[PDB]
């Protein structure tokens, strides 16, 4: 019923999208963080500051342990969690449960923060990233096989300036224009090929490579677009030219009273033909984000990673069976009834390499 | 490397009956939640019946409820499928699957 999962995601950018869910038996309800950069399916298993309930696994008659537990280190954060299997339903979408693993967390750093309005995370990347290895069946594999869904999801996530999660496909409503899709270059995150970066009509002065330095991907848990230092020196350069360094650095917000003093920032994307690419556009409502304003954008060390700054502008189409992933502008990326991302192609690759990926 | 390998198929009347099974290596069988998954002709992938690990858990889908038994033996990493009163809609490929995976699968037909 993917004409039910439309608004069934709550929060924004900064706390995250979360969808509720019910696990167990009877059902505990759950507010859980819809992540396309990992792959566990895990939830609080204990009390803690910063939420206000978890999962008791004494009180499912469902609930079977594996008898193991498994620790989950991001750059910023980690938890520790028993490893079991319970039933699951999501009310907004499906008429049943579904078996499913689940890690209830006992032990955690700078996972659970303040503001958070989640309780859990739901990882939907590809079984490779699960731990503790790719055996333990993802979330989303255990749906598309239990509840007969096509291999594919989809995003649009609405908080600039909810949303919906669409599993088993896409609703038209939720875009407007052209679907472009760009091929996943790995199975692991959603890894897909960055060809360029323009700022105000500019193009860097980058090889490809560099954006693919060590992989470009798609993720949902990630607030901010995250570029590899090189890639963000290049982009705070262009983008401070054609307009405060703690600003650059986020260690400071900036104030008035603004955007039409700042330019575009576009990502060229390969497209299905490799002959030729098309642009995802954010405008600046999307990177200098009202708080006083915050920068959008900061550096990362290994990955660029295309998170909520930017997918708040799109409706993003998982097609996993089809390996790719589709963009199209979505219409509720307004502010003040201003469209604040623009899509459009076809752009040539003929002065690109063949593979911009290392 | 991982493997699933069905068998036990092939043809039988209404009303038969039949044992597949799926035997796994490669990863610990014991751990992992196993699922039999089925595709007729001229339809979509129809979901038959799910078993927990330790074996305890068991879910079957309306059109089966019944009719099938799954089962698991993890000292032999086998899954069975059990199928009794079979039906002519019961034609189909039957795939043992588990993250992501699945075996080449076993024909069933059912015929009058």
């Known amino acids: 019923n993917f004409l039910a999962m439309v608004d069934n995601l709550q929060g924004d950018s900064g706390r995250g999208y979360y969808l509720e869910m019910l696990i167990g038996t009877p059902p505990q309800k759950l507010q859980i963080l819809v992540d396309t950069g990992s792959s566990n399916f895990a939830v609080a298993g204990t009390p803690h500051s910063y939420i206000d309930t978890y999962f008791d696994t004494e009180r499912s008659s469902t609930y079977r342990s594996k008898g193991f537990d498994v620790t989950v280190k991001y750059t910023q954060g980690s938890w520790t969690g028993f490893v079991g299997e319970d039933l699951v339903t999501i009310p907004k979408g499906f008429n049943t449960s579904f078996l499913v693993n689940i890690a209830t967390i006992f032990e955690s750093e700078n996972f659970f923060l303040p503001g958070i309005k989640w309780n859990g995370i739901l990882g939907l990347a590809y079984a490779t990233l699960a731990k503790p290895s790719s055996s333990l069946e993802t979330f989303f594999d255990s749906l598309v096989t239990q509840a007969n869904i096509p291999n594919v999801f989809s995003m649009q996530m609405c908080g600039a300036g909810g949303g919906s999660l669409v599993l088993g496909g896409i609703e038209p409503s939720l875009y407007k224009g052209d679907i472009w899709y760009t091929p996943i270059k790995e199975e692991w995150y959603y890894q897909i090929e960055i060809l360029k970066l323009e700022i105000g009509g500019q193009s860097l002065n980058l090889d490809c490579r560099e954006y693919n330095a060590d992989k470009a991907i798609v993720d949902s848990g990630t607030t901010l677009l995250r570029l590899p230092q090189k890639v963000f020196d290049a982009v705070v350069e262009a983008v401070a030219r054609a307009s405060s360094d703690g600003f650059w650095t986020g260690s400071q917000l900036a104030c008035w009273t603004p955007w039409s003093y700042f330019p575009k920032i576009s990502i060229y994307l390969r497209d299905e033909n490799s002959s030729r690419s098309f642009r995802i556009t954010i405008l600046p409502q999307l990177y200098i984000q009202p708080m006083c304003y915050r920068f959008g954008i900061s550096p990362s060390t290994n990955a660029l990673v295309i998170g909520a700054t930017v997918m708040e502008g799109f409706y993003v189409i998982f097609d996993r069976a089809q390996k790719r992933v589709g963009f199209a502008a979505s219409p509720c990326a307004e502010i003040a009834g201003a469209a604040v991302s623009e899509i459009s192609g076809p752009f040539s690759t003929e002065d690109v390499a063949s593979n911009c990926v290392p | 490397q991982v493997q699933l390998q069905e068998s036990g198929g092939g043809l039988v009347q209404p009303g038969g009956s039949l044992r597949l099974s799926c035997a796994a290596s490669?990863?610990?069988?014991?751990?992992?939640?196993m699922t039999w998954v089925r595709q007729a002709p001229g339809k979509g992938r129809e979901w038959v019946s799910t078993i927990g690990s330790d074996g305890s858990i068991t879910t079957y889908a309306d059109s089966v409820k019944g009719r099938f038994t799954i089962s698991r033996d993890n000292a032999r990493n086998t899954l069975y499928l059990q199928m009794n009163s079979l039906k002519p809609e019961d034609t189909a490929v039957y795939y043992c699957?588990?993250?992501?995976?699945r075996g080449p699968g076993t024909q069933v037909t059912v015929s009058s």
């Open positions: 699957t588990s993250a992501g995976r």
């Open positions: 490669g990863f610990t069988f014991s751990s992992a939640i």
